[PDB]
Structures are given as C-alpha cells and as structure tokens.
Write a protein that binds this DNA or RNA. Structure first.
Ligand code: MG
Ligand code: MG
Ligand code: MG
Ligand code: MG
Ligand code: MG
Ligand code: MG
Ligand code: MG
Ligand code: MG
Ligand code: MG
Ligand code: MG
Ligand code: MG
Ligand code: ZN
Lengths: 152, 115, 108, 308, 217
RNA sequence: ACCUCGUUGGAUCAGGACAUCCCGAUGGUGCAGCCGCUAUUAAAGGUUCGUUUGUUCAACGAUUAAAGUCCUACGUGAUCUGAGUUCAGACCGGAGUAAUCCAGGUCGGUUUCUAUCUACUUUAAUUCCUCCCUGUACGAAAGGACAAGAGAAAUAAGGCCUACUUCACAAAGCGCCUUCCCCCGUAAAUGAUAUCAUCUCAACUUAGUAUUAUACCCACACACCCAAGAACAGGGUU
RNA sequence: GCUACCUAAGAACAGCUAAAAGAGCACACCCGUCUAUGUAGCAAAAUAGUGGGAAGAUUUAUAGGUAGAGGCGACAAACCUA
C-alpha cells in the first residue's frame, strides 16, 4: 500500500535518491536543459522550482545560501543561481521549469524527459501548439462566442 | 495494560506489599477474558511465594483521554472476598475507578489522594 | 516443482497468442504538421528534437570554448548570435555565443 | 492512420476557445443546477403522508472527514461528516421492472465533467436536464415515497436522532497477504523458521485432494462495497448540507457514500417525524436553523457542561 | 501573533471545507472557554468537571510535555509527580468539560516535545500543586527556558540521543560516553534537512485561518 | 503354548461427525426455589493461558460458560519446525574371546524443490457480568427464581483514523465505530377406530417458525493524476 | 603441485596489557562455534554476522621424500588430485 506516498524510491535508498536528484539539479542549473529518465525528471522538477524560490530569497539569506550549497555540487553555479536564474524569474511566481516527454532512450527503451529552465538561451524545444483558431471547429466556436456575447 | 509475568508495584499499606523479597511481585493471572488488565481489573499476584489477588489502580499504558497515565503499574492487594489487604493507599488513585463496573468503594475509601 | 506433462502446441498457442500477449496497435501516432514527420501525440517529434539537440550541442561547444575550464559558469546572461546578427539593446551586458551558421528558421 | 484515434474535448480547440468552452459549459452546469432549486413549483409528484412500512429515498453524500463530538453525559463520540453535494433524483422505476417487488429511485450526486462521460450517459443527463453525476445508486422505496426525477436532495432530508445505514467502497489495499487480509497468525520469527513467516499454513486437508471454494487466501483486499448499519445522525449542518454520522464510514475521504434510513428492526418505524418524501426547502414551512442538533449533543458555545 | 497549533492542518487530501467547519466549532467553543496561549514546557493548571462526581471540579497542574492533534480533538499532555508518583494527563482542549485552563508559567523549552522528562530526574517533572501564577509583561517575547535536564541511567523510554529526535534539552555529556554519541550519530540523515520537497509551507493557510478568526471576533 | 522384542509430534490453517463439553428447547426426578442427577432434541456458534517433560500423554497452577469425544493418510511437513528409529563421532551399562551386538541411557549431528495441470484466491454475532423486574415467585425460615428490559465489557466479523499510540501528507493497533430471525424435543384443543377416554404415523385446531428477511451491486460502446492498482482493470481531469 | 606426516633451507606475527609466558585483550594471519542466506548457488562447501587461536604443539612460501594391502594418521577408518 502506498496511499499518499508522494516520493519515488530511487537509487540505492533515501540518501542515494537525494544525491541522484542533486546531480540532476546541478546539471539542470549548469546547462539549463537536461535529458533524463522521465521519472527522475518528474521527481527533480519540484526541487528545481524550490531552488529557484530559495534563490529568490536572496544571496544574503543564510538559509538560502546553505540550501544552495547543499543542492549545487559545483559551487560556481551558486552565484549563477543567485544572480542569473532568480533574477530571471523575479517577476514570475512559479512554473520556472518546462518538462516534455522525449522519444524513448535507445539504450534501454526508458521513458525519457527533457527539462529546461524557462527563458534559457538555448534553441527552443518543439513545443506542442494548439490548433489554429482558423480551423473549422474553432471558427464555429468563435461564431458561438460572438452570438452568445451579442445575445447575453 | 498488565498481562501475565508483568512486574507490578504494590501501592498499599499491607505487610505483603511492603515486605522485601528477592522476586518483585509479578502478575500471575488477569481476571479478564483477554489476558490484559487495565485500571479496575483484578489480577493474581505472586508475592513472597504466595498467591494474592490484587486490583490495578494505575499503569504506564496510555488510556482514554482525561485519564491519568502513571509512571509505574500500581496495584492494590485485595482478599478473595474483596476487602483490601492493606489499610492505606499513598499514591494517587484515578477517579475513573468510581463509575467502572465492579466494587471499588472500599479502595476509594482507603485511598488518600485522587488524580 | 517439475512439470508433470509436456504442454502441447495447441495449449501453448492458446496461451501465447492471447490478446493480452499480442502487441497493441497504437492510435496516438500522427504527422507533425511542421515537418511532416511521424510523432506520438504527447511526445516530441523525434526529427525536430534531434535538430534542436544538434544545434544545442554546437552552442554548448562554443560555450565551452568561451569559458575555457571547469567551474567557470558566468554570473551573467547568455545570448546566441548567428552570422549577420548584432547584439541588441537588450542583449547588452550578456555574453555572446557566436555561431558560424545562419539563424535557423525554427530558432527565434 | 487506421481511424481509431482517441480524441478528447481539448484536442482540436484553440488557445482562445479553450477558456471560452470551459466557462460556457460551467455556466450551463450551474444554470441547470439552479433551475432545479424549486421542485415544488415544477409540477411535483403527489406528496403522500407517511404510513407504517413506507421506505423513503436516501442520499449520496461525500465523506468529508471525522471529528470529535461530546454528549451531555460526558462521553466522546467520533463522528464522520458526509456532505451532500449536488444530489438529485435521476430516475424512477416501478416494482415490476425494479428487479424485485419495490419501486426504485436512482439518485446521483457529485456533478462531474461532461467531457469525460460516455455518450449514452451524456444523453441521459441531457434528457434529464442536469449535469452528470459521479455515482448513481438505486434506492428501494414504496410508491408512497416516489419523487419526480430532477428534484434535489439535501442533508436535512435526515434529522438528528435518526439512525442511518452508510454503504461505500472500502479503502482498497491491493493484493494483500493472508496475515493482513484475514488476520492469520503466521509463523514464529526465529527458532529455525526459514522463508515462512507470513505464509498460510495448510490450506485444506489431504483427503479432499483440493481446496474448498471460499478458502481464505492472499488476494485483493478492500475496494468492495460494505455497509455500516445503525449509525446515529448526531447533527445536521443545513447551510453546508453536512450530516454528522456516528462512528466510522467505509471508504476514504472525499469518497461518495450511499446514505439511507437504517434497516435495523429496532429502527423500523422511526420515520414518522422524518420528512417523508424528502425535505423540501422550497416548501419554506419553517426555515431550518444553520445546525440541527441531537438532544444529547454538547453543542459548542453552550456553557461548559457541569455534571450537577 | 500566536496561532494555536491545532488550527494549522496537517497536509493531506482532506477537503478545506472540513477544516472550515471544524474551525467554526473550535472558535465558537473558544468564545465560551478561554484557551490561553501556551507552549510545550509551560506549566498549566486545568480545571475540569468530573462526571464520576456530581458537578464537582478537579484541578491538575503540570508541565505541558506535548501538544498534539489538530482540529476539535486537539490534545495537550502535561506531567507532574504526586507523592513521588509520576503522572501524565492528556487533556482535550475542546472537551466541553474542561472548565478552565490557566497558564501558571508561560515559557518555551529548548525542545518542542518534553517526552524525555519521563527518563529525566524526577525533579524536572516535580511542580508544586499550589504554585502561584507568574506574570509576564504584555509586550514581551515568550521566555525560552534553556534548562538542560539530567537523565537517569541509560535504559530509557526512547533512544533520546538519536538525531531523529533532535533533542537539545538533555545533558548527553553527563550520561553518555563519546563513543555512545558517535554510535548514535550513525542515524544522522543529513540530507533530511535539505530535501526541499519535505517542507510544509503554511504561510497562506495561517493567513486564511487568521482571517477566519478575525471574522469570528 | 520357553524368554524377549517388532515413523512421531508441534506450529499454521483447519474441513467434517454427533456418540453434546458450554450456549438453546423440553420430559422425569429418591428435585419444595436454588440446585444437582437422568433422558429427548439441538452441530448456528464457541471450546484459555502456563510449569516439568521431546512427550504421543500425564500431573500440577490459574482460569473459563465450556476447556467435548472423535474422523479427516501427524487432517495438514513441494507451508515451516522438532524429535526419535539412527545416520557416520564419543562415553556409561549389559552380552560377546574378539569383531561387534543390545530403543538401554547421555552429549553432537546439512535432504532439496524456479508450481506444468487440477483446486482455490471478497458466501442478520455470540457469550458473560451487573442492574431493573427480584428479596419478587417459591419457601416455615434459611436460601432463592423465572420470562422481559437496561447498561457494561470481552471476543468474533466487517470497517475506520477524530483523538491516543507506532507514526506522519499515509499505513497501522495497543485506538475507535457497527453488528439484525428462527428451527420443533414436546405441551395442549376437539375427536373417532374402541359412542368414556385419547395431542391425531385418524380426520382436525394451536404453540409453529425458512418459502432466510433483507440489505449490497446495477449507466453497452492520448496523456496526466489518484484515497484504484503487480500488469490489466477502475476513478478524476470544468 | 590436494591432503597426511617428514626433511632442507626461508618468512610472518600491529597495538595495549604484561614481563622472558604452549600468558591476557585484540589486528594481520590461521580456523570454523552458532545463526541466517545460498541449495544447478558467487561457490561440486560459498557469503554475512558471530565466534576460537593469534610468540607457538603457530601460520606459511619454496624444493625434496614416504605409494595402494602400501603410505600417512595428536584413531576421525581420517587423508593419499572434488
Ligand atoms: Mg531500483
Ligand atoms: Mg508473529
Ligand atoms: Mg527468515
Ligand atoms: Mg518502552
Ligand atoms: Mg443427539
Ligand atoms: Mg557410532
Ligand atoms: Mg555444537
Ligand atoms: Mg604481538
Ligand atoms: Mg597465547
Ligand atoms: Mg596431524
Ligand atoms: Mg575411534
Ligand atoms: Zn517534426
């Protein structure tokens, strides 16, 4: 039974899970875009968002500095987190990351996901775009919208 | 909860309770269909190589809210008829003993403090 | 426990040709209207993703050449510029990664 | 390419039309729900008085959680809150076609998205004029208690001091071993015991050369319908349509439970004072208080009880 | 501003309406019984009517060794020793038969749970039954009693020295060897203070609860 | 018709019989009530924990309403475990020239199975105590009831997490909640064969009831999340 | 070339305690008490923990020797290439 269990069991245990997520998060901060197995990306996404929140807390915040020191294994990324990533998202309140599914890994057919920090300098991912508003169904719905607006 | 083989503290004025002995008093039988004794349950004790009935008046196991939890499993020696063997109970006795089914007025009369 | 009898090919066919064992037909496969490639609805187009990955790898090679060593993550933003492009007013004070090819159509 | 593509409502909608459709359909849902708020002014079925041997309809509530409650004697009773969420009478069938010999009312609750329901269900709810409900349960009633489909049902359909039966799917515990599923003793942890600690012992005798049907074995535990009988209705919050039912109710929080008058013989004819067809707020005979209490309940805000 | 612990819900999938209803009942009971601010480690005297007697009140004074539960069923267990007998009572805050809760000595202890007072020396649980209530200035932070208790020999109710308990109010140096402390450190789990997805942020929930309380006023 | 001597439990889960140990209903009594004894009927349910012993048992201790007798290849060892024949070592005792023999005593002592097939894997609760009725009925007193009701526990079954506890976005118990109908042995009424009488394998009329009452379930038709879950399936996505 | 015993010539044995020890605790090293795992296994005898010895009747490398009714044996009919 795992009712309400919100954390996956990864790696070799709890510490190993944290270290795996830490390595993934460090890679995400360094490269701003990471391919990894979909479950590990999904597990690490929350930590990525929380890292951006801690970076927003400020460079001088001692708790934020300690959290960044733990979660970034390469220490040149801590200035990056506090002076690039957090300022990039100061306006936003959430959704700092974008996670998309990728064709399965050729090695072991693993479910793969690409996770990026929004607003990076890299080429944009081929995002899924909704149908054009000029399609037949959308135009009929636009007609409904206009009639409803006029009538009521 | 007091079961068979639980060592118990005789909180009583009785000579059996207050007499030193190599073996501490140890519950031999719980007069309850499940062998688990709570406050107000009678047990059979092996004291000084003698089998004596006794009444539970406190235990470390948590009970229902508003009732006291004691640091020891306190017991009071009683005769087969029901008369307390001792004449004074020093440690506090829970007031919840009053409304429980069973004869406890003698024990309450003997008791000095209530909690 | 060892099998008591050899299982017949009739029984074995009934077992291993069950619909539970047959490969299911996928109905989420469509054509990427952008480039006309086959993709699953919820998954990125493989060809488009390979394009983006190759371009990202080139940009990252240029980034590595610019940084020149480990532990040299800049504390400033980065902008990628292609041939025939000039830093904008917004791109001021941001490290410039110069690519020798022209700006891809899918890049903006 | 084979033509069996599975579509969902959002698939072909544009960025502009998605919020428009969401808002439009939600507005239609709430308008439909409001249109049923005055059943007595909408040609109600005949409202017969209560007679002995009459069974009225029940509700479909949502298990909110549990909280303590105290009675004037000083005892604590754990109570479970059941919220009646958009519960409506949906269907009526006579004794002949009820799979028995008692009229039946199908009742639903907990409105759900129309985008996620089968076409036949959507058509049924369209004819009924209501948004679709998550669960539909059938209540056996006498013809005295027939209610017109579409009529809403409220927590005040019950009253404090009444006894109730609550049936729901229990918490699913998945494939469970026999120690957890049936409370088998298992085997000792040490003294040479190897690789058998939680296993069933013998499952039968050697003579029969087989295993009896119904033998207790490891398997799926829970996620089956169970009924708790004879639970006292301690309180009713009419504002939020909450029933405070004594003790435990099967199933998890935020799960739909079917609530009906208790079938126990002791509570056979306690329906005299209960709203017989159902409670009609539109009747407005006396606007009920925000909270209806049982007599013994230590109401909050009352002066602290003293056993004088 | 002190929000009483029972108001903040433990996280879960339970509907917020249930908490709204429960808080309504809790506040409506607080309008009758004044539930004062107190912390684990503060000394309290609770007066409650006894159903066993006939309209007679019982008073118990002791140190609040634990605050637990949420909602209408919230409890605090407080401890004392009476004639050398350690006793603990777990009082339900919103039980209608608690007549009064008096904070004899409002103070905070180094730990949020004093369950180790069971294994501490009896002096650290002894409190005079008739001790008079101390007074704190209206505008004043709650005092923190940095008392570090001395423990009785090592067999204890719990392995208090283990890091999962995070006990600060015990003099471990007096009762445990450095080897024992090092051995206890094997259960350290240092990552557990840094996993950000485990922290429960209750700022918005507390703000909403405060709005509800102020509206109730 | 000289002597001798020729696989077993336990744990786990139990299925069944009734030749009934307790609970139910009756007849009689060398039982006034209480009781005991005996017999008929009754198998729905229940039938404890320990010390010594490997004990198969047995005794003892403390209980219980009771601690039933059995069958089921020990019921059950491809579920586990333990003896002990009896392994291969070594002593003691007896026999034998010796080798060796002797359940005649003791200390030590590894059989292993990945399940192919059958079968199977979710089918209205009981006791006990206390109180009321009851010091009432009965009885000279002593002693001491039925039936009916209320409350407490406990157990069993089914659930649940508000508290407590183990714990902590949940799972659990040591916690809490709920559990509903009987079975037939006899006792009678009228009454013939046999004009009385007679309860009737006579016709007939009652106690007398299972014809389980119910309750539960009931919508034909990507992806992600989930209190749903091994996969699948199920629920939600407004 | 295993093993048993022997021959020649080697080597190893921390630290503490003790003081010239078939001494004590305890590494390396040797062994194999008990438990668990494993049981076509990692292994035709292993693994993990626990445990015994650990300056000696110790362990051990190298070369040599004793051969089948024979050898060798601190006797377990033990060992002499599973
Ligand atoms: Mg793994
Ligand atoms: Mg066990
Ligand atoms: Mg095991
Ligand atoms: Mg303990
Ligand atoms: Mg019989
Ligand atoms: Mg021998
Ligand atoms: Mg041995
Ligand atoms: Mg040395
Ligand atoms: Mg030595
Ligand atoms: Mg030798
Ligand atoms: Mg020999
Ligand atoms: Zn494409």
């Amino acid at each position: 039974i795992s009712h309400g269990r919100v954390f996956r069991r990864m790696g070799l245990g709890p510490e190993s899970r944290i270290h795996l997520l830490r390595n993934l998060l460090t890679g995400l901060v360094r490269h701003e875009r990471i391919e990894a197995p979909w479950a590990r990306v999904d597990e690490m996404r929350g930590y990525a968002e929380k890292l951006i929140d801690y970076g927003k807390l400020g460079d001088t915040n001692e708790r934020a500095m300690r959290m960044a020191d733990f979660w970034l294994t390469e220490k040149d990324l801590i200035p990056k987190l506090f002076q690039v990533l957090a300022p990039r998202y100061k306006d936003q309140t959430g959704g700092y990351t974008r996670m998309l599914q990728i064709p399965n890994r050729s090695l072991d057919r693993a479910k793969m996901a690409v996770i990026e920090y929004k607003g990076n300098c890299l080429p944009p991912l081929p995002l899924p775009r909704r149908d054009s508003h000029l399609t037949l169904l959308n135009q009929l719905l636009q007609g409904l919208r206009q009639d409803l607006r006029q009538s009521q | 909860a007091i079961q068979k083989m639980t060592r118990v503290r005789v909180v009583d004025n009785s000579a059996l309770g207050n007499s030193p002995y190599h073996r501490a008093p140890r519950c031999i039988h719980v007069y309850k269909k499940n062998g688990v004794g709570k406050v107000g349950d009678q047990i059979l004790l092996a004291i000084k190589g003698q089998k004596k009935k006794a009444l539970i008046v406190g235990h470390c196991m948590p009970g229902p809210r508003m009732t006291p939890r004691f640091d020891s499993n306190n017991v009071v020696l009683i005769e087969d008829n029901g008369n307390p063997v001792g004449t004074r109970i020093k440690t506090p006795i829970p007031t919840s003993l009053r409304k429980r089914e069973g004869e406890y007025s003698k024990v309450l009369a003997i008791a000095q403090n209530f909690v | 426990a060892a099998p008591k009898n050899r299982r017949t090919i009739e029984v074995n066919r009934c077992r291993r040709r069950n619909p539970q064992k047959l490969i299911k037909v996928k109905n989420n496969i469509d054509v990427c209207p952008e480039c006309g490639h086959l993709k699953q609805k919820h998954v990125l187009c493989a060809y488009c993703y390979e394009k983006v990955c190759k371009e990202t790898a080139e940009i990252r090679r240029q980034i590595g050449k610019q940084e020149g060593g480990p532990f040299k993550a800049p504390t400033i933003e980065t902008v990628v510029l292609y041939t025939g492009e000039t830093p904008s007013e917004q791109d001021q004070g941001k490290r410039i990664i110069e690519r020798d090819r022209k700006r891809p159509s899918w890049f903006t | 390419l084979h033509g069996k593509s599975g579509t969902w409502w959002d698939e072909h909608l544009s960025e502009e039309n998605v919020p428009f459709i969401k808002q439009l359909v939600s507005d239609e849902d709430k308008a439909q729900l409001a249109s049923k708020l005055c059943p007595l002014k909408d040609e109600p079925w005949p409202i017969h008085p209560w007679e002995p041997g009459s069974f009225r309809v029940g509700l479909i509530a949502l298990k909110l959680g549990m909280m303590p409650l105290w009675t004037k004697d000083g005892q604590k009773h754990v109570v479970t809150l059941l919220q009646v969420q958009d519960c409506h009478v949906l269907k009526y069938t006579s004794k002949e076609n009820c799979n028995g010999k008692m009229a039946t009312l199908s009742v639903g609750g907990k409105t759900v998205s129309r985008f996620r329901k089968a076409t036949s269900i959507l058509e049924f709810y369209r004819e009924l004029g209501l948004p679709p409900k998550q669960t539909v349960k059938i209540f056996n009633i006498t013809d005295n208690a027939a209610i017109k489909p579409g009529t809403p049902l409220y927590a005040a359909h019950f009253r404090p001091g009444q006894y109730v039966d609550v049936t729901a799917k229990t918490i699913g515990k998945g494939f469970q071993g026999v120690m957890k599923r049936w409370g088998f003793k298992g085997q000792p942890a040490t003294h040479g015991q190897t690789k058998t600690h939680r296993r069933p012992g013998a499952v039968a005798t050697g003579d029969i050369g087989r295993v009896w049907p119904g033998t207790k074995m490891p398997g799926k535990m829970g996620n089956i319908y169970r009924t708790e009988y004879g639970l006292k209705v301690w309180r009713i919050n009419t504002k939020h349509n909450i029933i405070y039912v004594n003790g435990s109710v099967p199933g998890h929080k935020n799960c739909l439970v079917k609530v009906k008058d208790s079938k126990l013989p002791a509570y056979k004819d306690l329906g005299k004072n209960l709203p017989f067809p159902t409670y009609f707020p539109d009747g407005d005979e006396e606007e009920l208080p925000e909270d209806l209490y049982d007599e013994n309940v230590c109401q909050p805000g009352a002066p602290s009880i003293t056993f004088a | 501003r002190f929000l009483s612990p029972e108001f903040i819900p433990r996280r879960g999938r339970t509907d917020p309406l249930k908490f709204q209803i429960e808080r309504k009942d809790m506040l409506e009971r607080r309008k009758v019984l004044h539930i004062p601010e107190f912390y684990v480690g503060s000394i309290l005297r609770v007066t409650t009517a006894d159903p066993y007697a006939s309209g007679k009140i019982s008073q118990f004074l002791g140190i609040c060794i634990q605050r637990s539960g949420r909602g209408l069923g919230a409890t605090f267990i407080l401890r004392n020793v009476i004639e050398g007998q350690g006793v603990e009572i777990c009082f339900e805050l919103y039980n209608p038969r608690v007549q009064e809760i008096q904070v004899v000595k409002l103070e905070k202890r180094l730990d949020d749970s004093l369950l180790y007072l069971r294994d501490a020396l009896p002096e650290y649980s002894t409190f005079d039954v008739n001790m008079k209530p101390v007074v704190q200035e209206p505008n004043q932070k709650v005092p923190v009693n940095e008392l570090k208790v001395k423990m009785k020999p090592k067999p204890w109710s719990k392995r208090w020295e283990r890091p999962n308990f995070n006990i600060k109010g015990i003099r471990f140096d007096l009762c445990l060897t450095e080897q024992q402390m090092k051995e206890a450190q094997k259960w350290n789990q240092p990552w557990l203070e840094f996993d950000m997805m485990r922290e429960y942020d209750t700022s918005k929930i507390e703000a909403a609860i405060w709005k509800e309380i102020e509206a109730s006023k």
